[PDB]
Design a protein around this ligand. Structure first.
Ligand code: AEQ
Length: 292
């Protein structure tokens, strides 16, 4: 579908994702400019095709799903850039708190929407959060992890980041709930505020032990069942829990409260997206225009 004579002409390479390359492309027939993901499996085609109806203003629009000549292509709307580039462009000054708050509010709306339709993402990270120039932010790639799994390395052998991965996934839980996305978004909220990743693990055990060093080694008091998880070891070091006050300065008390609730160990206790939207942190939310 992408080429000189095809439905889509390539304009430039945008990025490389977990499953394939993403090009900015133009569609010869409609004039439309799109982002076209090329991935190089029937159950997955049925599942991904159902995502075309999961439309919301904070979800990157899925225009089409094409299966042809042993490739799967996803055609998405095109936006400005991803949040990882925006954070980097923003590094000397940081993203202003009111824009962090508007982005978090909008991301919680997109999660609330997908979760109400029983679709989870399970691999949220700044690279799949896309912004436009007007102040909106949207989530890309919902539902693709359920379709394909999350591999250790990408198609180009790149390491798939662990930094946003919830502790129940690292501890080898068999069942993932929508809570896994609230954990990832809490980690991304902290990184916007502090301008550094919260838990930049470089292996599964470094990621777990970074989480325990900040939030305390979990036990049965705070997380019933934790000592029976598959990958839990009684020999894990017992670290004391840090104050949030140290973790995400200069976030205000309402922001720390909300973040603490997005980072509860027990996925059952973790705040839901719908409840997060009602949190007092958002009482004064606005929609600022980003400085690009
Ligand atoms: C269908 C395209 C896609 O899967 N994604 C995943 C993340 C990369 C990306 C980038 C854009 C974009 O607008 O860059 C500005 C849109 C969609 C996606």
């Amino acid at each position: 579908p992408l080429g000189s004579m095809e439905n889509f002409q390539k304009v430039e390479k945008i990025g490389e994702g977990t499953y394939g390359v993403v090009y900015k492309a133009r569609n010869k027939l409609t004039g439309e400019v799109v982002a076209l993901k090329k991935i190089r499996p029937s159950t997955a085609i049925r599942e991904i095709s159902l995502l075309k109806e999961l439309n919301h203003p904070n979800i990157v629009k899925l225009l089409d799903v094409i299966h042809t000549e042993n490739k799967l292509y996803l055609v998405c709307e095109f936006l400005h850039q991803d949040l990882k580039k925006f954070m980097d462009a923003s590094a000397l000054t940081g993203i202003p708190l009111p824009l962090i708050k508007s982005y978090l509010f909008q991301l919680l709306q997109g999660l609330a929407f997908c979760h109400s339709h029983r679709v989870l993402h399970r691999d949220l990270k700044p690279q799949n959060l896309l912004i436009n120039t007007e102040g909106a932010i949207k989530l890309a790639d919902f539902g693709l992890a359920r379709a394909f799994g999350v591999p250790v390395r990408t198609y180009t052998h790149e390491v798939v980041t662990l930094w946003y991965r919830a502790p129940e996934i690292l501890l080898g839980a068999k069942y993932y709930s929508t809570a896994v996305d609230i954990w990832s978004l809490g980690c991304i909220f902290a990184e916007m505020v502090t301008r550094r990743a919260l838990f930049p693990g470089d292996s599964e055990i470094d990621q777990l032990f970074r989480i325990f060093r900040t939030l305390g080694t979990p036990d049965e008091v705070v997380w019933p069942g934790v000592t029976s998880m598959p990958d839990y070891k009684p020999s894990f070091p017992k670290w004391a829990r840090q104050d949030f006050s140290k973790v995400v300065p200069p976030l205000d008390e309402d922001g720390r409260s909300l973040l603490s609730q997005m980072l509860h160990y027990d996925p059952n206790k973790r705040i839901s997206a719908k409840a997060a939207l009602a949190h007092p942190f958002f009482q004064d939310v606005t929609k600022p225009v980003p400085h690009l």
